[PDB]
Design a protein around this nucleic acid. Structure first.
Length: 145
DNA sequence: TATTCCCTATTTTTT
């Protein structure tokens, strides 16, 4: 009779041997010529045992495909601005902050600093964009401060 | 110094 060999396989991995629509079992079945019958997990372990059978030769070689296959299953930155240079940064109508935001494509929005606890001598400017976009905004900001 | 615009992995078969 053909050699019969069982193969332990986790329930979450059983779908790999069977395959969707049986593309794996049907393909391996045709490529190797073997029939796989899955049986309850014997050993209390949460894994299904696969019972494969086929000619003593195909049984050994087929087991290798499934084993080899189963093994395969096993930027934002804040800019500080002193209340003294704030007028030269925004510019008349924000033509400066906009130019910087559009050319740098980053989104700038003045972050208010709590007067009670924050230092009224300093304001917080929020600046966000893509890593390359935010870096471009910082360059213009400097050369103007 | 006062005012702006943008973005918001599972699955199949026969006995």
């Amino acid at each position: 009779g053909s050699h019969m060999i069982d193969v332990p396989i986790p329930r979450f991995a059983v779908g790999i041997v069977i395959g969707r629509n049986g593309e794996m079992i049907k393909k391996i079945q045709n490529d190797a010529g073997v029939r796989i019958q899955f049986k309850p997990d014997d050993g209390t372990t949460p894994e299904r045992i696969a019972q494969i059978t086929g000619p003593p030769d195909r049984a050994q070689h087929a087991a290798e495909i499934i084993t080899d296959l189963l093994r395969s299953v096993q930027q934002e930155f804040n800019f500080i601005v002193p209340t003294g240079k704030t007028g030269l940064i925004i510019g008349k109508g924000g033509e400066t902050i906009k130019s910087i935001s559009q050319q740098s494509g980053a989104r700038i929005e003045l972050q208010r600093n709590p007067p009670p606890n924050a230092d009224p001598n300093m304001k917080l400017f929020t600046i966000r964009g893509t890593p390359q976009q935010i870096d471009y905004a910082r360059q213009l900001i400097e050369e103007k401060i």
